[PDB]
Every structure is written in C-alpha cells, then in structure tokens.
Amino acid sequence: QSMSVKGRIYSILKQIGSGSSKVFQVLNEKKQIYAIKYVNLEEADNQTLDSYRNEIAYLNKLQQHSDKIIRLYDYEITDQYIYMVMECGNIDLNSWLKKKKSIDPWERKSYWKNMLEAVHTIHQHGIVHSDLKPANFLIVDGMLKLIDFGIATVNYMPPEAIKDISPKSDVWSLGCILYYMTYGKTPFQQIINQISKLHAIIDPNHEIEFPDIPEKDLQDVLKCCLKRDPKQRISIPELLAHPYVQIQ
Numbered sequence: 680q681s682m683s684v685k686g687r688i689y690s691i692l693k694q695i696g697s698g699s700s701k702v703f704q705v706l707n708e709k710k711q712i713y714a715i716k717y718v719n720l721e722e723a724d725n726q727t728l729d730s731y732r733n734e735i736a737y738l739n740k741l742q743q744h745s746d747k748i749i750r751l752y753d754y755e756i757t758d759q760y761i762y763m764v765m766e767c768g769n770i771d772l773n774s775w776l777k778k779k780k781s782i783d784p785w786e787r788k789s790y791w792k793n794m795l796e797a798v799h800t801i802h803q804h805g806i807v808h809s810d811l812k813p814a815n816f817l818i819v820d821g822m823l824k825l826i827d828f829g830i831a832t833v834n835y836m837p838p839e840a841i842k843d844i845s846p847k848s849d850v851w852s853l854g855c856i857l858y859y860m861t862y863g864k865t866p867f868q869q870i871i872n873q874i875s876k877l878h879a880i881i882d883p884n885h886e887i888e889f890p891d892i893p894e895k896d897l898q899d900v901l902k903c904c905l906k907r908d909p910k911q912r913i914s915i916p917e918l919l920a921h922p923y924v925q926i927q
C-alpha cells in the first residue's frame with residue numbers, strides 16, 4: 680500500500696521484482712516516480728548482512744563517478760529491513776531483448792558504450808562482477824545503467840571461471856551480451872545440455888561462429904571479446920578506444 684523512507688512517504692504502484700527482497704515502482708509526495716527495493720533482514724546471517732552493506736556502500740561511492748550506475752537517492756537500514764530509494768528505469772536489458780525481435784545498429788552501439796562505461800567504473804574501484812548478464816542492466820531514459828555489482832544462466836560465463844577471474848572475465852560476459860544483440864543468440868545458446876555447454880565454453884577446438892555482418896568493426900569487437908585465453912582477450916580501456924565505440 681505505502682511506505683516511509685527517512686521522513687518521506689512513498690506510494691506503491693506495482694511490484695517490479697522479488698528472495699528476501701522485493702522491488703517496487705513508487706511515488707513521492709510530489710508524484711515523482713522512483714524504485715524502492717525493500718530487503719527483509721529478519722532471517723539473515725552476518726555474511727549476508729555484510730554483502731548487502733557492501734553493495735549499498737559501492738552503489739553510494741560510484742554514484743559520484745558515473746551516470747551509468749543507477750541513482751541511489753536515499754536509504755533506510757535497521758536490523759529488520761533495508762529500504763533503498765533509487766531512480767525508476769523503463770525496462771531491464773534482458774526483458775527488453777526478449778520483447779524486441781530486431782535491434783537498431785545505433786541503439787545497440789549506444790547501449791554498448793554504456794555497458795563499458797558502467798563496467799569500467801566498477802573495475803576502477805577493484806570490483807569484478809563475474810556474473811554479468813543483460814538482467815543486470817537497466818534502460819533509464821535511453822541509457823543503459825548497471826543495476827548491481829555482483830556483491831549481493833551460464834551462456835555468459837567466462838572460460839577461466841569454469842577452469843578452476845579478472846576484469847577480463849567481465850569482458851567475455853559483455854562480449855556475449857553484444858553477441859546476443861548482434862546475432863539474436865549467445866555463442867553457446869545452441870547447446871541445451873548444460874554440462875556439454877560448459878565443455879564447449881572451455882574447449883578451444885569449439886571454434887565460435889561469427890557470421891559476416893555489414894558492421895566490420897562490430898564483428899572485430901566480438902572476436903576480441905570472445906578469446907578463451909584471458910591474456911589474449913581485449914581489455915575495457917582498449918574497447919573504449921575501438922573504432923566501433925568511437926567512430927560514426
């Protein structure tokens with residue numbers, strides 16, 4: 680029905696998502712829209728508690744560094760609950776890609792720069808996500824914004840994570856997300872048996888297909904991102920200077 684976060688009252692309009700936490704589309708006293716995430720802490724161990732405090736801390740610090748990280752306006756933390764007041768975005772990248780059959784080569788490129796800016800910011804603060812998927816990015820006024828940092832599907836899993844993990848592990852993952860926006864399928868979507876899928880990702884003999892596309896610069900980015908040897912894989916600062924990201 681309604682909720683209070685640091686003196687301010689908010690009215691629920693819809694529930695966006697939901698284990699111990701629930702996300703809502705809310706309204707303040709000035710009828711301004713936000714997204715409040717309520718976390719129930721009643722049955723949470725110290726390890727869980729610290730992980731939650733660590734993502735809020737990072738979310739707080741990184742606000743000041745990039746507009747490609749979701750706005751955290753305010754928050755209320757007690758022993759029983761967490762209330763996080765954030766900006767409301769239109770739709771997450773995953774749901775957006777499920778609905779949208781095709782993708783505009785310009786909208787894709789714009790969303791790509793956004794993902795690199797967001798993931799580059801977290802790298803600059805010693806964070807490696809490791810579990811990057813489209814469900815982690817949000818569309819906020821024609822801009823992709825990173826929703827979480829991995830502190831609190833297997834098609835996006837880097838080969839090095841399975842062989843046993845660095846900022847290059849997030850490169851593989853982003854590379855898979857762009858491969859999806861380019862080819863409508865992730866590189867190992869064709870394999871259903873999850874065990875066999877994990878083998879294909881780490882097997883260098885399993886030569887990933889890259890069909891001929893009109894955007895030669897885009898095909899190159901995907902080849903550079905999806906190199907099984909992390910030492911051979913392209914970095915984010917290099918990706919940021921690629922002709923695909925920088926040229927019209």
Ligand SMILES: CN(C)C(=O)c1ccc(Nc2cc3c(cn2)cc(-c2cnn(C)c2)n3C(=O)OC(C)(C)C)c(Cl)c1
Nearest residue numbers: 695696702714716765766767768769770771774826827
């Ligand atoms: C399929 N879905 C549920 C949608 O079409 C959809 C997706 C996203 C939407 N907006 C939205 C979702 C949001 C936020 C802000 N706006 C903030 C968050 C959030 C939670 N934790 N952290 C660190 C950020 N958030 C969120 O978690 O969204 C999902 C439930 C979709 C994953 C809205 Cl209003 C609808």
